[PDB]
Design a binder for these strands. Structure first.
Ligand SMILES: [Mg+2]
Ligand SMILES: [Mg+2]
Ligand SMILES: [Mg+2]
Ligand SMILES: [Mg+2]
Ligand SMILES: [Mg+2]
Ligand SMILES: [Mg+2]
Ligand SMILES: [Mg+2]
Ligand SMILES: [Mg+2]
Ligand SMILES: [Mg+2]
Ligand SMILES: [Mg+2]
Ligand SMILES: [Mg+2]
Ligand SMILES: [Mg+2]
Ligand SMILES: [Mg+2]
Ligand SMILES: [Mg+2]
Ligand SMILES: [Mg+2]
Ligand SMILES: [Mg+2]
Ligand SMILES: [Mg+2]
Lengths: 75, 65
RNA sequence: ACCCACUCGGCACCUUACGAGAAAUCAAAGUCUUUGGGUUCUGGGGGGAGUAUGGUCGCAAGGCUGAAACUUAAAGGAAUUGACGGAAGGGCACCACCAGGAGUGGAGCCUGCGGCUUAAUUUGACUCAACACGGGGAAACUCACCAGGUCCAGACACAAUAAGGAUUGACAGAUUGAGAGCUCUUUCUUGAUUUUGUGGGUGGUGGUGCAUGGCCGUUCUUAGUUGGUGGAGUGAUUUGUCUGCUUAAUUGCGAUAACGAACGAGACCUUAACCUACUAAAUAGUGGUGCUAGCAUUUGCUGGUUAUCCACUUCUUAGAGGGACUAUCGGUUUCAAGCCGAUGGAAGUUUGAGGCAAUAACAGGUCUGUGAUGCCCUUAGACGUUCUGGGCCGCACGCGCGCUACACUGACGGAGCCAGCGAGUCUAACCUUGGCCGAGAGGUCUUGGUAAUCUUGUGAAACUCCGUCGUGCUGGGGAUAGAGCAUUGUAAUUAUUGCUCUUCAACGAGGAAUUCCUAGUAAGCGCAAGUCAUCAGCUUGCGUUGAUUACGUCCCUGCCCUUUGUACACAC
RNA sequence: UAGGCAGCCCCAAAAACACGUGUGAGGAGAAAGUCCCAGUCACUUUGGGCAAAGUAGACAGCCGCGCUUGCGUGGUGGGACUUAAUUAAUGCCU
């Protein structure tokens, strides 16, 4: 046998490209005149993630992105 | 016949070339009298030993110890 | 008239090769490179072409004479080997026949193939030598087909991306078969571990078996194939290697310009058949019984052991061996090879059966068994892989391998009830005893067996006996379909399969035709094993019961050889 | 009744012209058997081709109908003339 041509009935799909963003410090670190910087978002509260991961905020709830944990903004 | 297993080794081999694969075969029958383990000759090699012809006697010539 | 011996002339003939010839052959075709007796005619590669024209002869038909342009590297002669022949002859073979046996082809179903539909019903193979074959009884996988969804499992080098961060991976909702962040809202994180481009590689049941290897099938399981010396021929080549008889056989006996040899065959190896002769044995048994008990009773049948005994290896097993060599006799035949009959022997068909199996080949099959493969294709929206679903099984039809039946040599029920070949799990759930539940399949707790130990003594069917039926498409037959009960499996839906009930289809001995088969063989019957989680109507092996027929022939088929013919040699 | 176990019952004996029961000129409905047969396409026969034979096969065509221009809806096989069909072959290329 020889293969026939393939003409899909659905259009082509594209892959995820991670958004190259020019921020790593402004999202979590608050500007101070003296220099005492507080964090604006929580870390992995699982026992075996760590305390510097600065999880993914949303409009309604909290997801980590790394430590799999799910929490609440109204805490 | 079983003499092919007793006296003959056989090899086959593929050789790669730019044109294709080549099949080489080598068949070797070594001397059966050098086998020294089991069979000594071919199964149909029937050799009769010499009669050792002796000069016949005429007188009795009894001999005593 | 005949016979004999001569002779001249003639038609021929037989042997030989003096001698010739390319050879076939030739007493001329000899007396020719050692070439000269006399003389006439004819040819100069093959076609064009014995054609055109001219002449001449003829009533005509045509005869005689007779070119050129052009075209071509061969045409041709004799002989050899092979192939082929709708040529002759001789052999062989239940993949041929005779005589028979069982059948298939008829009926229903299982399965393979062709055809049709489809998005797909994947493909390979089409006489023997395709059609229960790819050891292919496919629900996932097998898969290579189709339809969808991801992943790269795209090495390595260079140039960028750029660490003000190349990029992987993401819960949740939507989308999606999907509890795939596949992608959309989102910012979390891993962090030369990536991404893009080129070169280059890799995967591919993608193609090409008419590019190939290996392997297998076939010629051919037939019996054929070679060279040494010598003989023949200028040579290719031939004899040896054969008229005949014999054999399974180029097996031998013989014949004989052949003689002596090699491969094949045979020999050989494995299995089966025998051994009261050897070695033995709680993983095999046997007898008395060290021990014991049962029942019938004055001993028969047993149940339990080897420090709950001893003896032995007949039966069982595997090591070494012996035995068959066609042995003795008779007949026949070249008194040879042999063949046949009888006797004996476990064995007298190569003792039965297989394994290996010569030279030379096929555009035989397989690239889809191979990480065997050249080339080609594809290599990312993949012809790679994976996930989901379906399919290969689709049904107006045809053919083949098969199973079940058409009945009384039977169907069903009860009773007795013997094999052999094998397979087995902790290298995880294999073969299963016992106990219990369940009509049943099946389920529960265990036990023995990693194995001559347990399944297992596989307590098999067929069968033997006793009953029911009594020639009724009937209690022969079980096609098809409905309901449920359980197993294996993620998944039983197109019903995997088993089981209980119910329907009782065609089939009333089957056309042309076609297959296999000579002894523990055909055939009947069952059993174990391949595949397998399950499923065999298939296959590889095993055992039980066990015929009839013939010891032959070339009628048909196919194969081989000899002669013969050929303008064939790629070989009809 | 010849026989069989045979007195029943049971299984089993005995032909030829009617030109005849196979007609007419018979008319008609429904179908079978054949020289000659069928328009294209498929396959089946072949190692493969053709030439011939075959298949309930698709499109036809034909016979008609429907409310028609466009078309659809049904059959989609029908012909003609003989005392039991005989198949002799390979019929020709590659
Ligand atoms: Mg004369
Ligand atoms: Mg010349
Ligand atoms: Mg000339
Ligand atoms: Mg035949
Ligand atoms: Mg016969
Ligand atoms: Mg039959
Ligand atoms: Mg049939
Ligand atoms: Mg597939
Ligand atoms: Mg991906
Ligand atoms: Mg010579
Ligand atoms: Mg010769
Ligand atoms: Mg041999
Ligand atoms: Mg199939
Ligand atoms: Mg047994
Ligand atoms: Mg029945
Ligand atoms: Mg029922
Ligand atoms: Mg001739």
């Amino acid at each position: 046998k020889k293969r026939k041509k393939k003409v899909y009935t659905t259009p082509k799909k594209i892959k995820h490209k991670h958004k190259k963003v020019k921020l790593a410090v402004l999202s979590y670190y608050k500007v101070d005149a003296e220099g005492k910087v507080t964090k604006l978002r929580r870390e992995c509260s699982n026992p075996t993630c760590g305390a510097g991961v600065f999880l993914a905020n949303h409009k309604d709830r909290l997801y980590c992105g790394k430590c799999h944990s799910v929490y609440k903004v109204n805490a | 016949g079983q003499p092919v297993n007793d006296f003959i080794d056989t090899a086959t081999r593929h050789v790669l070339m730019r044109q294709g694969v080549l099949g080489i075969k080598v068949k070797i029958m070594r001397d059966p009298a050098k086998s020294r383990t089991g069979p000594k000759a071919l199964p149909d090699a029937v050799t009769i030993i010499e009669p050792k012809e002796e000069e016949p006697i005429l007188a009795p010539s009894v001999k005593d110890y």
